[PDB]
């Protein structure tokens, strides 16, 4: 006994009846990039000395 719908018998009219999830997609003309490694890009100032 497992209370999950692993396998069911469905008519052809119910094939497209599992569409109930809201998916969000990004346009192909826009770009997605990762900028984590940019976090360490910097330079150290040196104190004046003789």
């Amino acid at each position: 006994f497992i209370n999950k719908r692993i396998v069911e018998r469905v008519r052809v009219g119910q094939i497209l009846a599992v569409l109930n999830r809201r998916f969000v997609a990004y346009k192909g003309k826009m770009r997605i990039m990762d900028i984590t490694q940019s976090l360490k890009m910097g330079t150290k100032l040196a104190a004046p000395t003789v």
Binding site: G28, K29, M30, R31, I32, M33, D34
Partner: protein, 50 residues
Amino acid sequence: TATREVDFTVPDVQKILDDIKALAAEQVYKIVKVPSISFRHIVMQSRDRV
């Protein structure tokens, strides 16, 4: 990054400006001696109607 592949080339602006300048010499009209033929006739075996 994830985006469509675009080749970032640089063109020469001098040739583009020269082409734009040369485009002003074109003419959208023509000078003719006679108009083109607009009607023609087909003759059957009859000598009365065409």
